[PDB]
Every structure is written in structure tokens, then in C-alpha cells.
Amino acid sequence: RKPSFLALPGHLVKSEETVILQCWSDVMFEHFLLHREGKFNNTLHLIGEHHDGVSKANFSIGPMMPVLAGTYRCYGSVPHSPYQLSAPSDPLDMVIIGLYEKPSLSAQPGPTVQAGENVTLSCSSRSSYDMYHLSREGEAHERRLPAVRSINGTFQADFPLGPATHGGTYRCFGSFRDAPYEWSNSSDPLLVSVT
């Protein structure tokens, strides 16, 4: 019963940029409520019109600030204020990136691997990140692992990619535990080739 929910371009957005949040469904709604959860949660309203087959509202968000970052869900209704909200939509995590110094990202043992074999990608920095996030280009979610700190002073997390199937261009971001939705600059993109 849930509207569809989509970020454009995506859910990872640089500071001071703008993004579009789109809610749409088979059902024709005439009223969408965009809800961001958490501290300073907020609900935004848009009188989306469907044109036929589909109903849609496009929410504008930004310029991107730490306070518009967090988890969003869209709700459809039919009556006017004060609505009767349909099922939630799949949450989306609006992450504000390019905000701290980019981590280093590196492949072990190498960026090229035989099918079925494991690769581990390591996220590193001397900055004191509590968490790291691994992005494969073209995906909408990112793995996260807690940064453990090494005697040498390096903050690091190691993501095993599992049995190599297809390649991917990988990026990673650091974040601090008080601000889970606020991320560093992306690391330099690493390209894994499977053989």
C-alpha cells in the first residue's frame, strides 16, 4: 500500500547541494507527506498530481545541511488535512557527504581477483572516525563497519567482499558516532576486476 520512494540523483548528497525526493504509486493519492525521523524530525506536505497510471510528488530538499540529513519516509493520503496516511514507504537515508577529509581505501591483496576468491577492502585514516561506510558504485545502500584503531595511530575497517562474482568501483566514507548521517569526503574510487 506504500508509495514508491526514490532519491534523485541519490541518497548521498554533497553539502549545499539540492536533491529531489520522489514519492509515487499505482494508487492515486492527491496528498503526500514526506516525513524525516529523529531529532529535528519534520513532515512536509505536497499536493502531488498523478497523470495517468501513476501518482507523484517531487519534494525539493536543500541546499543540503546537517539538519535535513536522516531517515525519510513518504506517506500517501486521499483526504485533505488532516489526511489518513497510507502505509509508510521504504525509508531512505539522506546522507550529507563531502564534509571531512577523505579516507584512504585499498585492496588486499589486490584490485584484481579470481572468481570465487575473497577480496578485502580497507578503509583508513588518521582522523578519528568511529564508523566507515563502503559504497559500490551503482548501489543505493552502503555497508558499515566500526572503525577500530591501531597502535600506529590509524583508524581502519576491513570489508571482505566475499566470493568474487562481478567487479565494482568502490568508495568509502568515515563518520563520527554522534552524527551517523554526516560523512567525510569520499575516498579515491577503487576498481575491483574479477577474472
Tell me which H or E stretch contains 113.
Answer: strand 112-113
Q: Which residues contact 119 (CB under 8 A, 6 or more apart)?
A: 107, 108, 109, 110, 111, 113, 160, 161, 164, 192
Question: Cβ distance 64 to 17 under 8 Å?
Answer: yes
CB distance 28 to 55 below 8 Å: yes
Q: Which of 36, 40, 43, 5 is nearest to 21 (CA)?
A: 5
Q: Which three cell numbers stand for residue 33?
A: 507527506
Are 132 and 183 within 8 A, CB to CB? no
Q: What is the DSSP letter of 165?
A: -
Which amino acid appears at position 39 of this protein?
Answer: K
Instruction: Report yes or no: 2 and 88 within 8 Å, Cβ to Cβ.
Output: yes
Query: Residue 77 class from Cβ within 10 Å (0-12 exposed, 13-18 middle, 19+ buried)?
Result: middle
CATH architecture of 98-195: Sandwich (2.60)
DSSP state at residue 54 = B
**Would you say the CATH fold of 98-195 matches that of 1-97?**
yes
Cell of 184: 567525510
> Domain residue spans in the chain?
1-97, 98-195
Residue 103 CA to residue 133 CA, distance in Å, equals 10
End-to-end CA distance of the chain: 43
Residue 53 Rama label (left phi>0; alpha psi -120 to 50; beta): left
Measuring CA to CA, which residue among 111, 139, 127 is closest to residue 173?
Answer: 127
CA atoms within 13 A on the CB side of 175: 23
How far is residue 23's CA from residue 92's CA, in Å, rounded to a whole number? 11
Q: Which CATH architecture has domain 1-97?
A: Sandwich (2.60)
Cβ atoms within 10 A of the Cβ of 106, count?
Answer: 17
Q: What does the alpha-carbon distance between residue 146 and residue 174 come to, in Å, rounded to a whole number?
A: 10
Provide, for the chain, the percentages of residues in helix, strand and coil under a 3-state DSSP scheme, each rounded to the nearest 5: 0, 50, 50
* Way it was determined: X-ray
Nearest to 173 by CA among 138, 134, 143, 127: 134
Which H helix or E strand runs over 157? strand 155-163
